[PDB]
Each structure stands twice: as C-alpha cells, then as structure tokens.
Design a protein around this ligand. Structure first.
Ligand code: PGW
Ligand code: NVH
Ligand code: SOG
Ligand code: SOG
Ligand code: SOG
Ligand code: SOG
Length: 293
C-alpha cells in the first residue's frame, strides 16, 4: 500500500506537478512582463512630466526586457522541459545571442542611470544630463551590446535529437571567456553601482524629497537585478570555469537548479514594472489608468 504510493509519486504525481508549476510560472512571468513593460513605455509616451533621464533609461530597460521575454523566454521554457533544441541551427545562434544582448543592454542601462544620479547628486556641475543626450547614450548601449555579444553567437552550435550548446576547441578559452563575461556583465557593474548608491544614500539621507523617492526606487531595481541574476551567473562560473555538474549522479537536481535560475532572469522583467508601481506614484497613476480603461 505504502510502496505503491511512493512509486505513484515518483513516476507520475511529482513529474506532472513539476511540469505544471514550471509552465505556469513561465506563462505568468511571460504575460506579466509583456503587459507590465508595455505599460512602462506607454506611460512615458502619454505623460510628458515623466520624460526624465532616468525614465528614458527605464524604458530602454523595458525594451531589453521585452526582447528577452518575447523571443528567449519560450525557447528557454521548451529547453527546460525537453532538454533538447527544436528550433534548428540558425536560431541556436540567434536566440542565445539575443539573450546575451538583452543582459548587456540591461546592465549597461542601469549603470548609466547610476552614473547620471551620481553626477546629478554627488558632483552636481561637472557633466550635463538631458533627454536628448540620453537617447544618444541609449543608442550607444545597443551598439556596444550588439557587438560584444557576437563571440557568444559564434561559439553556439546545434549538434545531433538536437542539442544547442557552446563549442570550444580547448579547455582554457571557455574559462577565460566566462570569467570575463561574469565580471563585465555582473560583478564590476553592480559593485560600482552599489558604491554609487551608497554615496547617493549618504548625500540625500545624511528637490531632495523627489530625488529620495526616485533613488529609493532605483536601489530596489538594482538590488532585485543583483538577486535575480546571481544564481545563473554563479552556476555558469561553477560550470564553465570550475568544471562542475558533469556527473550524472543527480542529472535532475542540476536541471532543477539551472531551470529555476533561467526562470529568475525572466522573472526580473516581470518585477521591474511592479517595482515602479509601488515605489513611483507617477507610474502607479498611469498603471491605475490602464486597468481602469
Ligand atoms: C570595459 C570592458 C567591457 C567592454 C569592452 C568594450 C570593448 C568594445 C570593443 C570592440 C567592439 C568590437 C567587437 C565586435 C566583436 C568581434 C566579432 C567577433 O567576436 O568575432 C567572432 C570570433 O569568434 C570566436 O572564435 C570567439 C571565441 C571566444 C574567445 C574567448 C577569448 C577570451 C578573450 C576575452 C573576451 C572578453 C569577453 C567578455 C564579453 C562580455 C566571430 O568571427 P568569425 O565569424 O570569423 O568566426 C566564427 C568561428 O568562431 C566559427 O568557427
Ligand atoms: C535564450 S536560450 O534559452 O536559447 C539559451 C540557450 N543556451 C544558452 C543561453 N545563454 C544563457 O542562458 N546563459 C546563462 C547566463 C545568462 F543567461 C545570464 C547571465 F547573466 C549569466 C549566465 F551564465 C549565458 N551565460 C553566459 C554567456 C552566454 C549565455 S547565453 O548563451 O545567453 C540561452
Ligand atoms: C532534413 C533535416 C531536417 C531536420 C528538422 C529540424 C527540426 C527543427 S524545426 C525548426 O522549427 C522552427 C520553429 O520556430 C523553425 O523556425 C525552423 O526553421 C525549424 O528548423
Ligand atoms: C563599456 C562601458 C560603457 C562605455 C561608457 C561610455 C559612455 C557613452 S556616452 C554616450 O555615447 C553616445 C555614443 O553614440 C553619444 O551619442 C552620447 O552623446 C553619449 O552621452
Ligand atoms: C559548424 C561550425 C563549427 C564552428 C564551431 C564554433 C566554435 C568557435 S571556435 C573558437 O575559436 C577561437 C579562436 O579565436 C578559440 O579561442 C576557441 O577556443 C574556439 O572555441
Ligand atoms: C573565486 C576563486 C577562489 C578559489 C581559489 C581557486 C582559484 C583557481 S581558479 C580555477 O580552479 C579550478 C579548480 O577546479 C580549475 O579547474 C580552473 O582551471 C581554475 O580556473
């Protein structure tokens, strides 16, 4: 009686429960991120008081988040289910490339917000910041991101069921590449950002009341980004630099860890508009307007 209910759980009840939760979490994030991030862009298009430097950059974060949610999220959901590539050789280069480009645009956008706030508050009359110069920064963020993520597209290969993965001729190249990737897309920008906002914090809490309502929001966006991107960033360093997760002792535990980590990246795109709702009264107003209409 008891042994049967253990194999019923193992062989049927747990796998379906797992697959249900996995698809439900991905679909919920997909819809919430698409609706939320479109309402961010519309809010600065409809409202003209909201067209500040920070908000022009926050719209660029949403464009990057939509790129990842529309194209990369479904490819990720199907790979996390089947553990195989079903989109052919071309999209095995394009989709991982667009994921990388999306991450680069996101972390560079947040960096330039911190840099703008750091000079706006801590060093006030050194550099001038306007919406016109913000659009030129935004285009430069895309140009850099599209270029620096070409080696990523270059190593992606689809090999025969098919599997999409990075192809490396030697053991040292993936170690150097993934070390640079982690430092450049995660550790150095967020460490510098942390130090910038700590100084902004000391200035505003050591025009002001408005700057405090927006700095507060900004620090939460950077903290949630750091948290959402930490599991996958660490897991890829452990795998590519420290040669971990090669033993099939618990093939499924490794899949579960990487699966949840992949979902968390996409969960961040759903999180940002929810943050602007509870920490920005101006955004909340145009969010209440969208649900009322
Ligand atoms: C502030 C600092 C951060 C920002 C720095 C800003 C600097 C911006 C500068 C220049 C922009 C222009 C770069 C444009 C990218 C250059 C284009 C490029 O990457 O060429 C590729 C080379 O592929 C390859 O083997 C690439 C394999 C990867 C080799 C890894 C070596 C480690 C070097 C460490 C790299 C850093 C990584 C950090 C990235 C975030 C593809 O070629 P190709 O189709 O002919 O071959 C295909 C062949 O591989 C298939 O057999
Ligand atoms: C869209 S996908 O599901 O088709 C797909 C298939 N295979 C691979 C990927 N990549 C991906 O998931 N990671 C894992 C990863 C992130 F996202 C984000 C990070 F901040 C750190 C990471 F460690 C990559 N990591 C390093 C370099 C390139 C990639 S990547 O090529 O962008 C995507
Ligand atoms: C003779 C060998 C043919 C093997 C077929 C490979 C199966 C991959 S189907 C894949 O589906 C995508 C849907 O997004 C399309 O965009 C792609 O073009 C297509 O490749
Ligand atoms: C890799 C680290 C990021 C590099 C940081 C450099 C800052 C770019 S400033 C930005 O550059 C645009 C280029 O198009 C100009 O048009 C804009 O006027 C200007 O504001
Ligand atoms: C079917 C097409 C097969 C192409 C395979 C693409 C793999 C990228 S080769 C890449 O070349 C670099 C030279 O710069 C070395 O540093 C790296 O060690 C090596 O990984
Ligand atoms: C964050 C690092 C602090 C821990 C100290 C160890 C530094 C060595 S790096 C790493 O050690 C691996 C061991 O498995 C090797 O296989 C890799 O070739 C090498 O790149």
């Amino acid at each position: 009686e008891d042994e049967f209910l253990r194999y019923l759980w193992r062989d049927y009840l747990y796998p379906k429960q797992y697959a249900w939760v996995l698809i439900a979490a991905y679909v919920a994030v997909f819809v919430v991120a698409l609706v939320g991030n479109t309402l961010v862009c519309l809010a600065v298009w409809r409202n003209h008081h909201m067209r500040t430097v920070t908000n022009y950059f926050l719209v660029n974060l949403s464009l990057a988040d939509v790129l990842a949610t529309a194209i990369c999220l479904p490819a990720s959901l199907l790979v996390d289910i089947t553990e195989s590539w079903l989109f052919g050789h071309a999209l095995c280069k394009v989709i991982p490339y667009l994921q990388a480009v999306s991450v680069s645009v996101a972390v560079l956008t947040l960096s330039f917000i911190a840099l703008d706030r750091w000079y706006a508050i801590c060093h006030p009359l050194l550099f001038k910041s306007t919406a016109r110069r913000a659009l030129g920064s935004i285009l430069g963020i895309w140009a850099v991101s599209l270029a620096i993520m070409v080696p990523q597209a270059a190593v992606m290969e689809c090999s025969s069921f098919s599997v999409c993965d990075e192809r490396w001729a030697d053991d040292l190249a993936p170690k150097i590449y993934h070390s640079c990737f982690f430092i450049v897309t995660y550790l150095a920008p967020l460490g510098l950002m942390a130090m910038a906002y700590f100084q902004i914090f000391r200035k505003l809490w050591g025009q002001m009341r408005a700057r405090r309502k927006t700095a507060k929001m900004l620090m939460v966006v950077v903290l949630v980004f750091a948290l959402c991107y930490l599991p996958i960033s660490v897991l890829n360093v452990l795998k590519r630099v420290f040669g971990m997760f090669r033993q099939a002792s618990d093939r499924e535990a490794v899949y579960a860890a990487f699966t949840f980590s992949h979902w968390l990246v996409y969960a961040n795109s759903a999180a940002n508009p929810i943050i602007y709702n509870f920490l920005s009264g101006k955004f909340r107003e145009q969010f209440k307007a969208a649900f009322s209409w």
